[PDB]
Amino acid sequence: MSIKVAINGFGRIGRLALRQIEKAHGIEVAAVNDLTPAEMLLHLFKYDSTQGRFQGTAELKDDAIVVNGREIKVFANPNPEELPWGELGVDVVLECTGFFTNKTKAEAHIRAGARKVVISAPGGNDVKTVVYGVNQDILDGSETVISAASCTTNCLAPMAAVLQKEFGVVEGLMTTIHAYTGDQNTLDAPHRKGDLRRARAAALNIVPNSTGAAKAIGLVIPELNGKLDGSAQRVPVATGSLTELVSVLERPATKEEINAAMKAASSESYGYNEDQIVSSDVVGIEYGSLFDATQTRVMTVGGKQLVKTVAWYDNEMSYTCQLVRTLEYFAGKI
Amino acid sequence: MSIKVAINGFGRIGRLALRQIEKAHGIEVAAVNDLTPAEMLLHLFKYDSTQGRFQGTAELKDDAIVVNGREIKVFANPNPEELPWGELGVDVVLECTGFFTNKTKAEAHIRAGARKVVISAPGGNDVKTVVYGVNQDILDGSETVISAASCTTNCLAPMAAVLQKEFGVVEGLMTTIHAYTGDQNTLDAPHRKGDLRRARAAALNIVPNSTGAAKAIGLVIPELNGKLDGSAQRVPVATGSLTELVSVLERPATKEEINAAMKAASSESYGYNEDQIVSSDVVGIEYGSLFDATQTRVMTVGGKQLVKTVAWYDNEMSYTCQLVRTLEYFAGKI
Amino acid sequence: SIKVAINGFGRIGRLALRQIEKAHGIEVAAVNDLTPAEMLLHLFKYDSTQGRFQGTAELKDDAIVVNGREIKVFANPNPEELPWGELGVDVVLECTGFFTNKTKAEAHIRAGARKVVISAPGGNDVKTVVYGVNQDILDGSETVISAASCTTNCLAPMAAVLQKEFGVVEGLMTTIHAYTGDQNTLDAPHRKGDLRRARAAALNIVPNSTGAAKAIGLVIPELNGKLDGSAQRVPVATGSLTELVSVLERPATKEEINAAMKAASSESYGYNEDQIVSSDVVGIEYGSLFDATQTRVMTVGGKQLVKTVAWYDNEMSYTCQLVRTLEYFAGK
Amino acid sequence: SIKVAINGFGRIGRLALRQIEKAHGIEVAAVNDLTPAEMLLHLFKYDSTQGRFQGTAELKDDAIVVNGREIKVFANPNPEELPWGELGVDVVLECTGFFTNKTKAEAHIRAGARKVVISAPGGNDVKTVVYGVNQDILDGSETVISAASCTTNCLAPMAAVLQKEFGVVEGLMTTIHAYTGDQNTLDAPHRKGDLRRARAAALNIVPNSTGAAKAIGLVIPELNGKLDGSAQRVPVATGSLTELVSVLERPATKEEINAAMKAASSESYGYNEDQIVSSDVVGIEYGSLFDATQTRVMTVGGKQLVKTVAWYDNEMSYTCQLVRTLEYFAGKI
Ligand SMILES: NC(=O)c1ccc[n+]([C@@H]2O[C@H](COP(=O)([O-])OP(=O)(O)OC[C@H]3O[C@@H](n4cnc5c(N)ncnc54)[C@H](O)[C@@H]3O)[C@@H](O)[C@H]2O)c1
Ligand SMILES: NC(=O)c1ccc[n+]([C@@H]2O[C@H](COP(=O)([O-])OP(=O)(O)OC[C@H]3O[C@@H](n4cnc5c(N)ncnc54)[C@H](O)[C@@H]3O)[C@@H](O)[C@H]2O)c1
Ligand SMILES: NC(=O)c1ccc[n+]([C@@H]2O[C@H](COP(=O)([O-])OP(=O)(O)OC[C@H]3O[C@@H](n4cnc5c(N)ncnc54)[C@H](O)[C@@H]3O)[C@@H](O)[C@H]2O)c1
Ligand code: NA
Ligand code: NA
């Protein structure tokens, strides 16, 4: 009995999740719901400006899409409760719309008949937050709604964990230079949420914006709670991002010690890089985070240290792969 | 007393229209209506990624914006009929939202109490269509709703006019390489109108798209009706465009004859250029169209001729300046 | 197995090594470039438009090891001194642009290479071949041929179909083209003197000349003198399309034209009906990809004007066409 | 009046001519670049990032006429061969980027120029000046000075305020910076061998080193050795910002920091409270523009980490600072 998945919101994250889940074993995507006709969804899945064509068969059947010979039901109801996840017997729902990133709203899928919900973004203090390779253990399968956190959280968390475990962290400020995203406008225009800076043209500007990945780091690594705060700078790349962390450490450290600590911590989720890469090189990586040893810097002024550690991540593909990893692990327990 | 104007849709065209109207004499903007809070509108009027900062004073008063010391009432009603144009005593309304681009929808402004309406886009066959400097004479002031046509039409019209008058046109195909616009998405995502190509990330792609500026050219130049059709290629420039016309002429022509005719036709609306300019040079021009003599090409094979003529235009500012010119001329007679 | 040497490890040369590694019966024995090997390895491994190389690439003393196989690296500016005979080289891809004529290219034959293919137009003494259009004109006796420009490989298959099926009186070509290295990053003086390539490539629509239309006679003789064209450079690092507005001898319908291109589809010439954009054409292996969605036939008083549009990745499509011509010329 | 020659009619050289025309008591007698006069005029008239030149520019035989005044044009790559002596040029603006040290700059003095100002860091033996911070150190006796890098002119006023009001223990600087000429249009070999500037400028976030922070000692001696930084080049043709995460000696609140920067405002150092973006800073005449919105103070256990951010137009902001240093240096010389 293979786990059944439905994807709510066939956006960048939802669509890439279908690509990765197809390769995954024990999981298949029974249905997708998005407020657009199925013809549009098929096109956007087949062709991709940043991630390349889907390496597989994609065809259109009436009210459905056939991916590699398997039909996937398509729905367009904006209200989650109305969706027939119960009639489909779906096990888990990927909440990728960005409008139901909270415990109560995610439960609407449970009312529709879905057993569990995983949110493709932060979901508040009431739901569990998981960065794979850091705190996947906390899941026991009993939770109805969990959150895979933000893309920046999946990039920062492994890097911050190593600094805390090996040297201890007093405090840190995080600056993430981030690719532009959907909430930004194509050209200067009114913004739905009221942000005067996302209202501005995404591809023309360095755009300051807030991010909570550092403050909310407490939900992933409790030992780091309250020690980090951060900001963001959105820049004209359609995908590909990096995370800088200026941190004060409890124990003194050398740039070689830090890089060696990260290399030991490398996993399927956390990569170690020594080449002189740039953002385009990170597009499509499956790591949730890619630590760049070249960017490590330790500065010592009068026996006082300030440390910069940097990790690349593809806000789209890196997060998606971490999302699928958390989805598989959550199925084993659930 | 001065002509009083209200702007519906404080978008790229609506906001630039406010800039040009301040400089214009005998015309002022009494109010703007947009489904945005005034705080956002003031900001987007003051700061511009492509057209530069507004050269003037702009401040926020309760439910209004004060531009150069003069109050402008701000409303946020999406339904045009509900706006109080009668109360404010508004001579003309600029329909710049892009959602009311036809005679019937535009009439909601007249119901609200506005005397006249000018549509910042094509409005079909039922309303008069005017490219200033080509057919403004057709207006007698009796019309309730008129259209300034598309930005592409204001570029194509003066160039095609010279060709028809001097050489005569059998037929022509138009290709306009056009800056990306709001109707395109920032990143691959479903599109509201269902266009699979405007759905694609605007800043990453050459995006073929339809344009009716060539077919509807009959409403501007009746002598050319049915003789032209064209398409568009949207490319990653935030503003600045050009229009090519490959045309068969009735009388034989040389490249020098064509350039001389266009220079003779030059006006405030139609410029003549001999420098080797590029798209960025056209940003902020006040001409509705700028003929590029350098790109003109006449090809003869066995006495059969094919002619290429090219003209630059800033889809935002060039169209906005033509829009104001038609707004004044229509206001003198209205 | 065909043994190939690449003179000039630029973007085309590097992508050619990627495509040749995938190809069976053909391998790259050596590359000669005056650039340091540490840099050449980096640009081979990492590509901003074409992505990471799907393979192993490491540097060993005086060579680079691609998928476990040594490839000799040389830095001699004089091709004749290179040991093409010792390595057993069959064909040379001349991608430097400095040996683009019969005599200079022959220096590779003196070095021991059997034949040479130039990745740019080659002059009045060498044959010009767009694979899938006129490879037949080769009789195997030639030492040096030219694969023409990337733009020629996009225009040629589409124009050949029009000439054979309907006949062409005349045509004008406009190619909306990705920006290229010769354009400056930011406004600055330009080496060749072009006031428009001097302008910042990623910020502008940049008119510029193209000779693909005039030279079409070398590929399709019956189209000689019937075509003229220009180019518009737009801010995409790769991916392009070619429009051709043409007057045809015989009347045609858009369905007739699209059906004809579909019949002409091959490994080199693709036929597309989806609503694609430039990013979708990046990395395609077709030399040209005809877009049926953009076809338009205009009739006004019995007089017709026809527009046909074909995509091509100026980098990869030309590279794959170059490899197709490279093997075919080695076999005859 | 003061006579100026521009060696290198690049982005900085051309913008310097625009600002120098507006300046009084200074005029540009000649420009030298390894380009034909036809090309130099075109690039002076038309600008993709800074807009068309608001003035008259025409071509005369071997010269360009800006606002009706002839400016002799030269194309000699060796400064020594240039005729600065015949032209009696008081100062030379070294904007090529190929003569950025005292020894190479002296070639202009051999050619007959009295003084040279380098539009970049010219080493730690030459006096280095950020206008509005340490212009006083110049007494006019120097033959070669440096106006420093664009990032230095952004960081210097902000760092000086922090040093005076709260004192600085140490700081790390990260500048998100517009791409520049030394980066390649498309992936290709790089002249200096930089594997990252070799990559296509408009497609990538490109880490790169910058010495603006370490050299801060030449501008603010009090800060010597306390700052180091790196840069991230991102795809904007112009417009930049500088972040500084710093440990302060005395505790501070974000409101205290913002108030201090506003008090320090001048023609060179601006204060901004709007939610601006990079395009908004294009064309500004400030050398640096402090963004109060971005200030942040992080206190964990009474241990403070402070972030201060300032925008700058790497082209125009530096050029206006360069002209300001040129005027002051011409009064003293
Ligand atoms: N892509 C990233 O950089 C990234 C990284 C991490 C997390 N996220 C999170 O992912 C979510 C959005 O992902 P994205 O940015 O790829 O999405 P997106 O911007 O492409 O749009 C989301 C999709 O959901 C659909 N949708 C909207 N409302 C809906 C509704 N009521 N019912 C059904 N479908 C609906 C939209 O049509 C669209 O197809 C957000 O929560 C965001 O924080 C995004
Ligand atoms: N931008 C150009 O190059 C250009 C050129 C010529 C014509 N136009 C025409 O101008 C119109 C809009 O142009 P744009 O691209 O600047 O628009 P835009 O993308 O800036 O947005 C239009 C504005 O209308 C507002 N709006 C939307 N629905 C509304 C409603 N119901 N009531 C009130 N306000 C509403 C939006 O909030 C926004 O401020 C379109 O019809 C377009 O065809 C644009
Ligand atoms: N561009 C910026 O944002 C910026 C900011 C601050 C400082 N600078 C400094 O200004 C200098 C140049 O910057 P840029 O980017 O404006 O330059 P640029 O890249 O536009 O070119 C400078 C000019 O110098 C010319 N040149 C080169 N070698 C020459 C020689 N031997 N003789 C004469 N002319 C020669 C070039 O042809 C070009 O016209 C560098 O020192 C740079 O660090 C630049
Ligand atoms: Na092989
Ligand atoms: Na002066």
Interface contact flag, C275 A43, Cβ < 8 Å: yes
Count of C-beta atoms within a 10 Å radius of residue B194: 12
Q: Which amino acid is at B311?
A: A
Show residues of chain C in contact with D186, CB under 8 Å: 11, 48-49, 179-181, 237
Are C88 and C80 within 8 A, CB to CB? no
- Rounded to whole angstroms, how far apart are CA atoms C31 and C71? 7
Residue D11 labelled as part of a binding site: yes
Counting every residue written for chain B, the total comes to: 334
State the DSSP string of A286-332: --SEEEEGGG-EEEEETTEEEEEEEEEE-TTHHHHHHHHHHHHHHHH
Listed residue (A178, A240, A186, A182) closest to A209, CA to CA: A178
Provide the angle, in degrees to the nearest 10, between the axes of the packed helices A151-166 and A317-333: 80
In angstroms, the first-to-last Cα distance of chain A is: 13
Q: How many CA atoms lie within 13 A of A268 on its CB side?
A: 10
Chain Cα centroid distance, residue D44: 19
Kindly state whether A142 is in contact with chain C, defined as any CB-CB distance less than 8 angstroms.
no
Q: String of b and e for D16-36 (b: at least 16 CB within 10 Å)? A: bbbbbbebeebbbbbbbbebe
Q: Which atom of ligand 1 is nearest to the CA of A239?
A: 3
The angle formed by the CA atoms of residues D28, D29 and D31, to the nearest 5 degrees, is 80
Interface contact flag, D172 A299, Cβ < 8 Å: yes
**Mode of pairing for the β-strands spanning B207-210 and B228-235:** antiparallel
User: What would the two tokens of residue A122 be?
Assistant: 């932060």
State the span(s) of chain D assigned CATH 3.30.360.10.
Answer: 149-314
Chain Cα centroid distance, residue C269: 13
Which residue has its alpha carbon closest to ligand 1 atom 6?
A151
Resolution in angstroms, to 1 decimal, for this deposition?
3.1
Residue A155 labelled as part of a binding site: no
DSSP-based three-state secondary structure for A154: helix
- Rounded to whole angstroms, how far apart are CA atoms B236 and B206? 7
- The DSSP 8-state label assigned to residue A222 in this structure reads G
- Rounded to whole angstroms, how far apart are CA atoms D194 and D208? 9
- Rounded to whole angstroms, how far apart are CA atoms A296 and A246? 10
Show residues of chain B in contact with D280, CB under 8 Å: 47, 49, 53
**Mode of pairing for the β-strands spanning B241-249 and B169-179:** antiparallel
Radius of gyration of chain A (CA): 20
- Rounded to whole angstroms, how far apart are CA atoms D101 and A283? 40
Count of C-beta atoms within a 10 Å radius of residue A190: 18
Are A245 and A309 within 8 A, CB to CB? yes
Count of C-beta atoms within a 10 Å radius of residue A105: 17
Interface contact flag, B308 C205, Cβ < 8 Å: no
Kindly state whether D209 is in contact with chain B, defined as any CB-CB distance less than 8 angstroms.
no
| Residue B151 annotated in active site | yes
Q: Which amino acid is at D220?
A: I
- Rounded to whole angstroms, how far apart are CA atoms B165 and B150? 22
Residue in this structure with the two tokens 């008949």, named with its chain if needed: A113
State the DSSP string of A82-139: GS-HHHHT-SEEEE-SSS--SHHHHHHHHHHT-SEEEESS---TTSEE--TTTSGGG-
User: What would the two tokens of residue B182 be?
Assistant: 């709001």
Q: Which residue of D has its CA nearest to A248?
A: D305
Are D275 and D139 within 8 A, CB to CB? no
User: What would the two tokens of residue D9 be?
Assistant: 């009619």
- Rounded to whole angstroms, how far apart are CA atoms D16 and A4? 66
Radius of gyration of chain C (CA): 20
Count of C-beta atoms within a 10 Å radius of residue D54: 8
List Cβ neighbours of B40 (8 Å cut-off, separation of 6 or more).
A190, A191, A194, A196, A199
Count of C-beta atoms within a 10 Å radius of residue B281: 23
Are A10 and A32 within 8 A, CB to CB? yes
Residue in this structure with the two tokens 């840190």, named with its chain if needed: A172
Strands, DSSP E only, in chain B? 3-8, 27-33, 58-61, 64-67, 70-75, 92-95, 116-119, 128-129, 145-147, 169-179, 207-210, 228-235, 241-249, 270-273, 289-292, 297-301, 304-313
Are C131 and C287 within 8 A, CB to CB? yes
User: What would the two tokens of residue C328 be?
Assistant: 């075919």
**Mode of pairing for the β-strands spanning A64-67 and A58-61:** antiparallel
Helices then strands (H, E): number in chain A?
8, 17
Show residues of chain D in contact with B235, CB under 8 Å: none
- Rounded to whole angstroms, how far apart are CA atoms C28 and C20? 7
Mutation pick for ligand 1 pocket among A36, A39, A97 (CB with most ligand atoms within 8 Å): A97
Provide the angle, in degrees to the nearest 10, between the axes of the packed helices C316-331 and C150-165: 70
The angle formed by the CA atoms of residues A116, A119 and A123, to the nearest 5 degrees, is 110
DSSP-based three-state secondary structure for C13: helix
Kindly state whether A242 is in contact with chain D, defined as any CB-CB distance less than 8 angstroms.
yes
- Rounded to whole angstroms, how far apart are CA atoms A241 and A237? 8
CATH class of A150-315: alpha beta
**Residues flagged as binding site of B for D-glyceraldehyde 3-phosphate:** 150-152, 181, 211-212, 234
Are C25 and C55 within 8 A, CB to CB? no
Residue in this structure with the two tokens 């009993």, named with its chain if needed: A142
DSSP-based three-state secondary structure for B7: strand
Count of C-beta atoms within a 10 Å radius of residue C69: 13
**Residue B284: C-alpha distances to residues B11, B177, B237, D18 (Å):** 16, 18, 14, 19
Are D291 and D280 within 8 A, CB to CB? no
**Residue C290: C-alpha distances to residues A44, A100, C231 (Å):** 21, 43, 18
- Rounded to whole angstroms, how far apart are CA atoms A319 and A315? 6
DSSP-based three-state secondary structure for A242: strand
Please report all neighbours of B, defined by 3+ CB atom pairs within 8 A: A, C, D
Q: How many CB pairs under 8 A join B and C?
A: 133
State the span(s) of chain B assigned CATH 3.30.360.10.
Answer: 150-315
User: D297 pairs with which residues across the strands?
Assistant: D306
Which residue has its alpha carbon closest to ligand 3 atom 41?
D97
User: A189 pairs with which residues across the strands?
Assistant: none
Residue A243, H or E segment: strand A241-249
Count of C-beta atoms within a 10 Å radius of residue C9: 26
State the DSSP string of C231-287: EEEES-SS-EEEEEEEEESS---HHHHHHHHHHT--SSEEEE-S---HHHHTT---S
- Rounded to whole angstroms, how far apart are CA atoms D58 and C211? 32
Listed residue (A197, A227, A223, A225) closest to A209, CA to CA: A197
Q: Is the CB of A40 under 6 A from ligand 1?
A: no
Show residues of chain A in contact with B238, CB under 8 Å: 187, 201, 203-204
- Rounded to whole angstroms, how far apart are CA atoms A287 and A268? 6
Residue A212 labelled as part of a binding site: yes
**For ion ligand 5, residues whose CB falls within 5 Å:** D 26-27
Interface contact flag, D47 B276, Cβ < 8 Å: no
Are A186 and B49 within 8 A, CB to CB? no
- Rounded to whole angstroms, how far apart are CA atoms C245 and C255? 16
- Rounded to whole angstroms, how far apart are CA atoms D318 and D153? 7
Are B306 and C245 within 8 A, CB to CB? yes
Which residue has its alpha carbon closest to ligand 3 atom 20?
D10
Are C331 and C131 within 8 A, CB to CB? no
- The DSSP 8-state label assigned to residue B99 in this structure reads S
Catalytic residues of C: 150
Q: Which residue of B has its CA nearest to A238?
A: B187
Please report all neighbours of D, defined by 3+ CB atom pairs within 8 A: A, B, C
The angle formed by the CA atoms of residues C53, C59 and C65, to the nearest 5 degrees, is 65
Kindly state whether D180 is in contact with chain A, defined as any CB-CB distance less than 8 angstroms.
no
User: What would the two tokens of residue B30 be?
Assistant: 């009494």
Listed residue (A147, A170, A145, A146) closest to A160, CA to CA: A170
Which member of D196, D205, D300 has the closest CB to residue A177?
D205
DSSP-based three-state secondary structure for C181: coil
Residue B192, H or E segment: none
State the DSSP string of C18-78: HHHHHSSSEEEEEEE-SS-HHHHHHHHH--TTT-S-SS-EEEETTEEEETTEEEEEE--SS
Q: Where does residue D75 rank: exposed (0-12), middle (13-18), buried (19+ CB within 10 A)?
A: middle
Are B224 and B217 within 8 A, CB to CB? yes
- Rounded to whole angstroms, how far apart are CA atoms B68 and C125? 71
**Residue C221: C-alpha distances to residues C130, C134, C214 (Å):** 13, 10, 11
- Rounded to whole angstroms, how far apart are CA atoms A332 and A116? 13
DSSP-based three-state secondary structure for C121: coil
Interface contact flag, A283 C46, Cβ < 8 Å: no
What is the C68 CA–ligand 4 centroid distance (Å)? 12
Listed residue (B236, C271, C274, B205) closest to A45, CA to CA: C274
Q: How many CB pairs under 8 A join C and D?
A: 105
Are C245 and B246 within 8 A, CB to CB? yes
Kindly state whether B142 is in contact with chain D, defined as any CB-CB distance less than 8 angstroms.
no
State the DSSP string of D297-318: EEEETTEEEEEEEEEE-TTHHH
User: What would the two tokens of residue D79 be?
Assistant: 């400064």
What is the D24 CA–ligand 5 centroid distance (Å)? 5
Listed residue (C323, C325, C295) closest to C28, CA to CA: C323
Residue in this structure with the two tokens 């950025």, named with its chain if needed: D100
Q: Which amino acid is at C306?
A: V
Interface contact flag, B190 A44, Cβ < 8 Å: yes
Are D231 and D209 within 8 A, CB to CB? yes
Are C237 and C179 within 8 A, CB to CB? yes
- Rounded to whole angstroms, how far apart are CA atoms B67 and B83? 21
Chain Cα centroid distance, residue B252: 32
Are C174 and B175 within 8 A, CB to CB? yes
DSSP-based three-state secondary structure for D288: strand
Listed residue (B157, B69, B132) closest to B332, CA to CA: B132
Question: Which experimental method was this entry solved with?
Answer: X-ray
Q: Which CATH number fits domain C149-314: 3.30.360.10, 2.50.20.10, 3.30.930.10, 3.30.565.10?
A: 3.30.360.10
Show residues of chain D in contact with A236, CB under 8 Å: 234-236
Please write down the HEC assignment for all residues of D25-90: CEEEEEEECCCCHHHHHHHHHCCCCCCCCCCCEEEECCEEEECCEEEEEECCCCHHHCCHHHHCCC
Counting every residue written for chain A, the total comes to: 334
User: A247 pairs with which residues across the strands?
Assistant: A172, A307
Kindly state whether B37 is in contact with chain C, defined as any CB-CB distance less than 8 angstroms.
no
Listed residue (A295, A285, A293, A290) closest to A311, CA to CA: A290
DSSP-based three-state secondary structure for D224: coil
Are B243 and B152 within 8 A, CB to CB? yes
Which member of D169, D200, D234 has the closest CB to residue A206?
D234
Helices then strands (H, E): number in chain C?
9, 17
Listed residue (C187, C196, C269) closest to C234, CA to CA: C196
User: What would the two tokens of residue D132 be?
Assistant: 């509005």
Which member of A48, A187, A194 has the closest CB to residue B238?
A187
Interface contact flag, B238 A12, Cβ < 8 Å: no
- Rounded to whole angstroms, how far apart are CA atoms D182 and D174? 20
Listed residue (A223, A290, A282, A221) closest to A262, CA to CA: A290
Interface contact flag, B236 C236, Cβ < 8 Å: yes
List Cβ neighbours of C293 (8 Å cut-off, separation of 6 or more).
B208, C272, C273, C274, C275
Show residues of chain B in contact with D276, CB under 8 Å: 47
Q: How many CA atoms lie within 13 A of A279 on its CB side?
A: 31
User: What would the two tokens of residue D155 be?
Assistant: 């960081």
Kindly state whether A42 is in contact with chain C, defined as any CB-CB distance less than 8 angstroms.
no
Which member of A12, A43, A191 has the closest CB to residue B196?
A43
Listed residue (B300, B146, B297, B124) closest to B216, CA to CA: B124
User: What would the two tokens of residue D287 be?
Assistant: 């050398």
Which residue has its alpha carbon closest to ligand 2 atom 41?
B98
Which member of C43, C46, C193 has the closest CB to residue D39?
C193
The angle formed by the CA atoms of residues C181, C186 and C188, to the nearest 5 degrees, is 90
User: What would the two tokens of residue A288 be?
Assistant: 């949730």
**Residue D172: C-alpha distances to residues A242, D159, D299 (Å):** 17, 11, 17
DSSP-based three-state secondary structure for D246: strand
